[PDB]
Amino acid sequence: MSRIIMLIPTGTSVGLTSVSLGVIRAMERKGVRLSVFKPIAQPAAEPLKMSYVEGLLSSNQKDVLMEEIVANYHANTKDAEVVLVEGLVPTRKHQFAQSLNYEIAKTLNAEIVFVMSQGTDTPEQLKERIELTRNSFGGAKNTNITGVIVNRPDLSEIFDDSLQESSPLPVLG
Ligand SMILES: [Zn+2]
Ligand SMILES: [Zn+2]
Ligand SMILES: [Zn+2]
């Protein structure tokens, strides 16, 4: 209602749950009504099963899929003031994962926040992946790209955990 933020988890273990848990706690302390919406499960409405999503995509019913996601979004965010949307991890088996992430963010008019893990990267290698990730969601054109997490309420209030100088995106938390 007041702020829709979609977390794009760009890694098989980037601590997406830790980020969401921190947002739940920050909002509860401020009395802000928060809904965490996970449109699709990653193997008033549960996350859609991946096999159901694949069946709708297989049968050329992507429109039906998006309608169901939008309907579930509304059933799950009634009277929410902040909505945190949990996106899909791009895994080996699913070539539709990142296109579905973009389509969901676009349809929900969500601000996009990428959740990364440093892993083995050097600082500059991580920043290269951050810039690559931003360009793949529209780059400088897409005004909804909001920031990156590496591990109307202000983002500092939403992502309070309490490379930010040279990062391609503002680093949150
Ligand atoms: Zn409390
Ligand atoms: Zn699958
Ligand atoms: Zn339709």
Swiss-Prot record:
Induction: Expressed during exponential phase, decreases as cells enter stationary phase at pH 7.0. Expression is inhibited at pH 6.0. Part of the ackA-pta operon. It is found in: Cytoplasm. Disruption phenotype: Severe impairment of growth in anaerobic conditions, as well as in growth on minimal medium. Increased sensitivity to environmental changes. Poor starvation survival and slower growth on glucose, fructose, tryptone broth, or pyruvate, but normal growth on glycerol or succinate. It comes from the Bacteria. The N-terminal region seems to be important for proper quaternary structure. The C-terminal region contains the substrate-binding site. Homohexamer. In the N-terminal section; belongs to the CobB/CobQ family. In the C-terminal section; belongs to the phosphate acetyltransferase and butyryltransferase family. Involved in acetate metabolism. Catalyzes the reversible interconversion of acetyl-CoA and acetyl phosphate. The direction of the overall reaction changes depending on growth conditions. On minimal medium acetyl-CoA is generated. In rich medium acetyl-CoA is converted to acetate and allowing the cell to dump the excess of acetylation potential in exchange for energy in the form of ATP. The main pathway for acetate production during exponential phase. This is Phosphate acetyltransferase. The lineage of its organism: Bacteria, Pseudomonadati, Pseudomonadota, Gammaproteobacteria, Enterobacterales. The gene is pta. The chain holds residues 1 to 219 of 714 of the full protein.
